[PDB]
Amino acid sequence: DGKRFFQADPSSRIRAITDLIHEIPTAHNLCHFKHVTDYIDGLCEACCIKGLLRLPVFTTVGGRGIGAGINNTPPFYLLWHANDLAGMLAQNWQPWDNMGIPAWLGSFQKESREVGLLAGMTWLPRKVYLHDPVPGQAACCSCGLPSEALVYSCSIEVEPVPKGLEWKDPHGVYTDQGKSLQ
DNA sequence: GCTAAGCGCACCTAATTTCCTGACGGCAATCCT
């Protein structure tokens, strides 16, 4: 009962859990997919979390009506790598003077532009509520690890990314004209 | 019943020209709104 992680204002539109993830096929303009079917099998909690982290980074266009993420169409992502998590964090540490207001706080105040890095790296273009049914699953058949009762669907809306916001992702790659490099 | 040796060439020259095309025609869907 309170604030929730990567969740936002009240919702009405309901979409299946298959579209939060991208690697598994979703409800396209078809009926058959790569042997998946919506509202039958769902993802685990870890898969749901790793799909929620895909939202600020790898959200594409939804047919030119649904807007993209904060860093446009998802560009090339480049970073510095090491054999350890300590070297993982240390080699990509370069911070900026203004941090920003990340989305794991509540409803952030828009105020002026030039968010920084911490507000821009965690921008939420979608929402999640999910309606919990009475009990749930018995054996998992979508993730692969046989788990307890899992999710079935969710609820996704969009937020229009405004104009301006002169901002550069630290790991993104941007062309000569400032557009995203694909 | 049916033979056997020896002998078998090389030199000359072998060519010059000029011409050799142009224009036209080259496709679209449908594989995320």
Ligand SMILES: [Mg+2]
């Ligand atoms: Mg899984």
